[PDB]
Symmetry: C2
Subunit: 194 residues, 2 copies
């Protein structure tokens, strides 16, 4: 019943543009919306985010996260490892690549979401959420070698899965970090389950 009529370019950078979207509301009334898009998409989605489950025998299972300075936020954020999918790369392959670059861990694919939206009231940005397990007992994950690209500066933060939400709250309380909403969503459901 609702649909896009036209999109007016307002402003286009190298990485992001702003559009004025005209759409038909269900009553038959034309309306406008200010919409953001990335200029980099081809792809199933803009990006992947990786849920990396680090499994070591006789240890708690951990979720591997990354801490980085995020210029739009003006501060440091705690996030699932993540990056954009390369032209002609699959979401799975992007997940394992990003995970290795950002963490040095080598992982195995467990499952892969459909494209999911990041902030659909503002942008068209989408990602695949990719669950990956990491055999922390294998020699290739003993001393994980992180290969950052140009301009990535990533700290790795592993947190036990069974206390994830309490551990994150503690970091926010002590370290003036912002937690990512998808990380927080996942942590909450771990507590809310059953």
């Amino acid at each position: 019943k609702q649909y896009i009529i036209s999109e007016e370019l307002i402003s286009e950078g190298k990485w992001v543009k702003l559009e004025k979207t005209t759409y038909m509301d269900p009553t038959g009334k034309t309306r406008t919306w200010e919409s953001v898009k990335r200029t980099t998409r081809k792809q199933t989605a803009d990006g992947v985010a990786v849920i990396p489950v680090l499994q070591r025998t006789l240890h708690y299972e951990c979720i591997v996260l990354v801490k980085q300075f995020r210029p739009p936020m003006g501060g440091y954020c705690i996030e699932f490892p993540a990056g954009l999918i390369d032209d002609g790369e699959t979401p799975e392959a992007a997940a394992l690549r990003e995970l290795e670059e950002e963490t040095g861990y080598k992982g195995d694919i467990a499952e892969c979401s459909p494209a999911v939206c990041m902030d659909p009231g503002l942008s068209n940005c989408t990602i695949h959420i990719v669950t990956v397990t990491i055999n922390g007992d294998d020699a290739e994950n003993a001393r994980p070698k992180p290969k950052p690209g140009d301009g990535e500066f990533v700290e790795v933060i592993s947190l036990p899965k069974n206390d994830l939400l309490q551990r994150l709250d503690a970091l926010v309380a002590e370290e003036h970090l912002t937690v990512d909403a998808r990380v927080y969503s996942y942590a909450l459901a771990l507590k809310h389950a059953n």
Copy 2:
């Protein structure tokens, strides 16, 4: 180590702006970023709230109450937690219970309220509080709940059992063109993984 040097406006809409952000990298080198911000944030501790609404009813499995709306940025229908912006002077908890009632009809009870968490920190400064609310579906207030959508809001309510949320979401994605929100998907995945 890293910090913001300057923020130059590139383009300002009614609702959204684009900025050229200059910052210092941890090598001591100046770099830039293209940053999105909303124009509507005043003294709120965040832009908005998203509500995790746990519908509880005697001799029913708990349901997660979700909303389906057309999102102009996305050009299509999206399934999301009930959400909206925090009005000036409004508490995150008040915004949550208000938005929940407006979008679903349900009158909730506060359970917990997150710190401000980032929506897409590689792109925007946008933040929310994630507010968990329980709905006493045995109360007569919540028996045959009617939305009170504001102007240009057109919302369908979808309640899904917590104990099968991921499959039930997958089944809706299989049946029509719609996108699940990444925070919803993350929360459903944790429910499976716990």
